[PDB]
Amino acid sequence: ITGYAACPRNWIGVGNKCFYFSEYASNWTFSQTFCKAQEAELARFDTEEELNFLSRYKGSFDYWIGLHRESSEHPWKWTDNTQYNYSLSIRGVERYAYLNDIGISSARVYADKRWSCSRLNSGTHH
Amino acid sequence: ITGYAACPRNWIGVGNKCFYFSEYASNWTFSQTFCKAQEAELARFDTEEELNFLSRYKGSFDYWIGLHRESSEHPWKWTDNTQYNYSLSIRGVERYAYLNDIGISSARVYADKRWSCSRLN
Numbered sequence: 021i022t023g024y025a026a027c028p029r030n031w032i033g034v035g036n037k038c039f040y041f042s043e044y045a046s047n048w049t050f051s052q053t054f055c056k057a058q059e060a061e062l063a064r065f066d067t068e069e070e071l072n073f074l075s076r077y078k079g080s081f082d083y084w085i086g087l088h089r090e091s092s093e094h095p096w097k098w099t100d101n102t103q104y105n106y107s108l109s110i111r112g113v114e115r116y117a118y119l120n121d122i123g124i125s126s127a128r129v130y131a132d133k134r135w136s137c138s139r140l141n142s143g144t145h146h
Numbered sequence: 147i148t149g150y151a152a153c154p155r156n157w158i159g160v161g162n163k164c165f166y167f168s169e170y171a172s173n174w175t176f177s178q179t180f181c182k183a184q185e186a187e188l189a190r191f192d193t194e195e196e197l198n199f200l201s202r203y204k205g206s207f208d209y210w211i212g213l214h215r216e217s218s219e220h221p222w223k224w225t226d227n228t229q230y231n232y233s234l235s236i237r238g239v240e241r242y243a244y245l246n247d248i249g250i251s252s253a254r255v256y257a258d259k260r261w262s263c264s265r266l267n
């Protein structure tokens with residue numbers, strides 16, 4: 021690592037990331053607009069430590085995450101257009117991913133769910 | 147691990163603290179020995195943000211925290227011997243504090259509970 025630095029207020033630090041969690045349900049598009057306005061993205065995990073933390077901290081509520089696909093015949097990608105590494109199953113035939121009770125599932129864009137944002141920890145510098 | 151981290155691996159950063167959570171239940175003494183061996187202490191909260199994080203991440207399980215008293219007639223103190231600020235009530239007549247379903251309660255030293263550690267940074 022480069023250094024240790026606290027995530028900003030209302031954000032939670034796990035590994036080299038800072039997570040944010042809403043307590044308000046809205047649609048995937050509104051959620052991604054919000055995340056981008058925080059200089060962040062809909063939540064992305066790159067390690068088991070990070071996925072396990074999201075899956076525990078969410079409690080009993082569904083949370084939107086940053087995986088989506090243009091159709092059921094297109095590849096899953098992150099909101100930055102990085103392709104998904106297909107390391108976990110995703111349930112369903114819909115375009116927008118969320119964490120449920122069991123793991124990752126898919127929903128229509130206009131479903132109302134709480135959301136999480138992530139960003140790499142910048143060490144307060146960017 | 148590249149770039150910045152709030153905390154070391156297996157710890158979670160909230161404000162100016164790093165928290166650790168066991169998935170193994172033990173008695174309060176065993177828990178505090180463990181936390182000191184990590185250059186840490188049984189979990190201490192100094193803000194609402196920190197307490198709300200402990201109260202959510204614990205889920206449906208009881209967790210030891212760093213409040214303790216010598217008897218039901220003595221003041222609550224942190225494991226560093228710094229007095230409690232009495233900003234939240236604690237239930238019961240026992241000497242050792244834990245987070246339960248509802249808030250903060252007290253138990254005997256030999257009760258088995260998962261524990262949390264905290265440290266500054």
Ligand SMILES: *[C@@H]1O[C@H](CO)[C@@H](O)[C@H](O)[C@H]1NC(C)=O
Binds near residue numbers: 047049
């Ligand atoms: C998503 O939510 C926002 C805010 O309520 C609303 O403006 C927008 O029309 C919604 N979009 C969809 C596709 O439901």
Ligand SMILES: *[C@@H]1O[C@H](CO)[C@@H](O)[C@H](O)[C@H]1NC(C)=O
Binds near residue numbers: 173175176255
């Ligand atoms: C606490 O747990 C440790 C480890 O199991 C054990 O050595 C010790 O006797 C226990 N103490 C009490 C008071 O139960």
